[PDB]
Symmetry: C3
C-alpha cells in the first residue's frame, strides 16, 4: 500500500506530474499546511503533492509550517515523502543543474519547531528524542540514484546539506566556514522537514538541485533570487523526470520491513510519564 | 551557611538521596519550576532537590523553565547548585558510564532565554552581561573530582559540553563536526542552566554521565532513548554515591570568599540607566 | 542628496557630534525605535543619530528593535548608515582601542528577525532573499579607512565580526572556536542590523572598536561590563573624530550609481506571487 508524498520546492512549487488531479485543502492540529494537497497518480501509484512555499511561493522558509505539512501528508496515508529542494553548491564538482541525493545535514536554523511533541498537543503526547544518525531513507535514496543514472543525469550519490535560517543568503565568511565544516550544499528548508518526517515514521528522501555556487567561488555569477530561478527554469525538467521515473519503481518494491523498522524507531523515541 | 541545590537529570529525576524529605511547590516571577522542590538533608547539610524534567520526565529540554528553576533554588537560599546530566561521548576515552566534571560549554541552543534581565521583570532590572570565561565553580569541581577518585569511579577531570537544542539527537555530520570543534560530550540542558546560575551568584557544577557515543563511532550501539535509559539504569548509582559523598565535604569547607567574588561578578555585570 | 544615519553603540549612545540638534520620536510598522531620532548636521551634511540601546542604554542586544531602527532611518531619508559597535578582539594584533572597518560577519544569533518581509506587514509584501556576499558598503568603508589614516588612528582595513546572541559573554571554548573559524572580532549587534540595512537599500558601514580580548588571551584583563566601558571611556573620542571627519567627505562624493545598484539589488531580491 505505498502512497508517495511529494513536496515541491523553489521552481517546482506545482509541477504538472500527476494524472487524475484533485485539490484537497485540509487542517491539522498544528495549523494549515502551506497549500491544498493535490491528490493524483503517477502510473498506478497514489501520490499527494504539496507546494512547500504555497503554489504562488508566498511563504518564506522560516514561516513554512513544517509540522502541518508533514502531519497532513501522514494523515492522508503517505508511506514515503520525496521532496525537491533548490540549493547552493559548496563544492567545485557540484555544478548548477546537478542533482545531489543528500544523506546528511548540518542544522544552522534557529526559529523552527523540530518536533510534534512539544507538550501542547494531545495528538502527540510525551517527550520524543528521534535519532538522526541516518536522517534520509537509504532505500529510497538508492532508487533515486539508480534512476538518475538510467536518465543520464549528473547526480551525486551523497551529500551534506547545511540548512540556514534565512531568508537572507549567507555572508562570504559564512560560506567559506560551511566549506571548512564539510557541507556540500546549502539551503533553507531541509531542517526541520526531515526531522518531522522521521518522527512520523515516513521514508523521506530529498532531490537537491544545485542552482548557484553561493558566494565562495570566483568567476561565477553571484547567488540571487533571479539567478536561482533562472537555473531552475533551465533544469527543473530533470527533477520532474526523476520523480516520474522513480515513483513507479518505488511502487513495485517491497516496503513492509523498512516501514515497520521506521515505525518502531519513531515509537520507541517517545518517553511517556 | 551552605545549602546545596541539586538538579536531577535523565535517569536521576528524583534520586532517593535526601533524609527528612518535605515537598514544597513554589512560584517565581518567571513561572513555575519543573516540579516541587524537595527539601532535605545529606548528613547535616541542607539540600534542595529538583527534577529538571519533572519527576515523571514530562518536560522536554527546550521547554524546561531554566529561569524559574534557578530562581526558585536561589530564593530557597541555595549557595551551590550541583547537577546531573546524561550525555553522549564525543571521545573514545570517555566510555558510557564514565563521569565528566565539565569545565566548558559550546552553545548550540536557539530557543532559550539565557538571562533573568530581559527588561520585562521588575525583580531583575537593567542590562546584564555575565562573564562566561569560567562557567563552572572550580572549587566545587575540585571536590567532585577528588571524591570520584576516593570512590574509585572512572572520572574525567575536565571537558567541553556541546549543548544542542534538541529534542532530536544530532545527525552524523553534526556529530563529526562537534568533534572537530573540540567538544568532548553532548547534551541538551547545560545551557542556559549554567548561565542563569552565574547571574544568580551561585557556585554551579555539573556531574555529566556519558550514556552512549552519539552516532560518530563504529561498532557501538546507536544512541536512542532506550540506550540512554539502559546505561543510566546500570550506572546512576555512581552519580548518587558521588553526590552523597561530595556534599558533606562541601558542608565542611569555607565558602565566604568564593561566594562574595561570585556575588560581585554578578552584581557588576548589571548596567543600570 | 546624502543624509547620514548614525547608530551609536555602547559607550557612544548619544555622542555630542551634531550641530543644530532636534529630537524627534517616531513610530514604524515594526514598532518604536530604540529612542528618539536626533536630527542635526556635521558641517553642511544632514544626519540622523539614534542610540542603538536607548540613550540610557536600557535595551539589551536581543531586544533591540533592529527593524524599527532601520525602518525609521530609511523613512527619515537616510542614504547611508554608519554605526559604532564595541567588540572583543579575537586576534593579538587587534588591540583594545583599535578600530576595525569590518567587511564580513558570521551569524551566531538565534532570536532575531532578519527581514522586513515576514508575510505580516502590508508595508513589505513578498518573500525577500537579500544577498550577503558583500554586506558592507565598500565605498563608505574606503572613506572610513582613508580618514582613519589621516587621523593617525590604529585601524584595520577589514575584519570578520562574529555576532553572538548574548547577553552573556562567550565561554572560553566558544572564544577559541570562533578563532578557529577565522572571526577577528566579536559583538552582539552587527546581525541583523547589517541585513536590514541591505534590504532597505542603504549604504551601511561599521566602525568596530575593540574593547577587550574576550577570554582567549592570557595575561589580559578578562572581559566584563566594567572593562568594556573603561576602554570606551578612554578611546571613544577616536570614533567621534572619525565620524566627524568622514561624514563631510561622504557629503562631497558622488553616490547616485552606488545607491541605484543597492536599490536594484534590494528590489530584485523580492519574489512576488
Ligand atoms: C527564490 S530563491 C531563494 C530560495 C531558494 N532556496 C534554495 C537555495 C538556492 N541557493 C541557495 C543558497 N546559495 N543559499 C541558501 N539557499 C539556497 C532558498 C530559498 O527558499
Ligand atoms: C531520555 S534520553 C534523552 C535525554 C538524555 N539527554 C542527554 C543525552 C544523552 N545522550 C545524548 C546525545 N547523544 N546527544 C544529546 N543529548 C544526549 C538528552 C535528553 O534530555
Ligand atoms: C556594556 S558591555 C556589553 C556590550 C558591549 N558589546 C560589545 C562587546 C564588547 N566586548 C565584547 C565581547 N568580548 N563579546 C561580545 N560582545 C562584546 C556587547 C554588549 O552590547
Ligand atoms: Cl552554529
Ligand atoms: Mg556520472
Ligand atoms: Mg583514573
Ligand atoms: Mg529562536
Ligand atoms: Mg597603521
Amino acid at each position: 500500500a505505498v502512497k508517495i508524498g511529494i513536496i515541491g520546492g523553489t521552481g517546482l512549487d506545482d509541477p504538472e506530474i500527476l494524472e487524475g488531479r484533485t485539490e484537497k485543502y485540509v487542517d491539522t492540529p498544528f495549523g494549515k499546511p502551506s497549500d491544498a494537497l493535490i491528490l493524483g497518480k503517477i502510473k498506478n501509484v497514489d501520490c499527494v503533492l504539496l507546494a512547500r512555499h504555497g503554489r504562488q511561493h508566498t511563504i518564506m522558509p522560516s514561516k513554512v509550517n513544517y509540522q502541518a505539512n508533514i502531519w497532513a501528508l501522514k494523515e492522508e496515508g503517505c508511506t514515503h515523502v520525496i521532496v525537491t529542494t533548490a540549493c547552493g553548491s559548496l563544492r567545485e564538482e557540484i555544478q548548477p543543474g546537478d542533482i545531489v541525493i543528500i544523506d546528511q545535514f548540518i542544522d544552522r536554523t534557529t526559529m523552527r519547531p523540530q518536533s510534534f511533541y512539544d507538550g501542547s498537543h494531545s495528538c502527540a503526547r510525551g517527550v520524543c528524542h528521534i535519532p538522526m544518525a541516518e536522517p534520509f531513507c537509504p532505500k529510497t535514496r538508492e532508487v533515486l540514484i539508480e534512476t538518475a543514472k538510467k536518465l543520464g543525469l549528473r547526480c551525486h550519490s551523497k551529500g551534506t546539506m547545511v540548512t540556514i535560517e534565512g531568508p537572507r543568503f549567507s555572508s562570504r565568511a559564512e560560506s567559506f566556514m560551511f566549506r571548512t565544516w564539510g557541507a556540500d550544499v546549502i539551503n533553507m528548508t531541509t531542517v526541520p522537514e526531515v526531522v518531522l518526517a522521521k518522527e512520523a515514521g515516513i521514508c523521506y528522501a530529498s532531490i537537491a538541485m544545485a542552482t548557484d555556487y553561493d558566494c565562495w567561488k570566483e568567476h561565477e555569477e553571484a547567488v540571487s533570487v533571479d539567478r536561482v530561478l533562472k537555473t531552475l527554469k533551465e533544469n527543473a525538467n530533470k527533477a520532474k523526470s526523476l520523480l516520474l521515473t522513480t515513483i513507479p519503481q518505488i511502487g513495485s518494491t517491497e516496503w513492509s520491513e523498512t516501514l515497520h523498522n521506521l515505525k518502531n524507531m519513531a515509537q520507541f523515541s517517545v518517553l511517556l510519564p
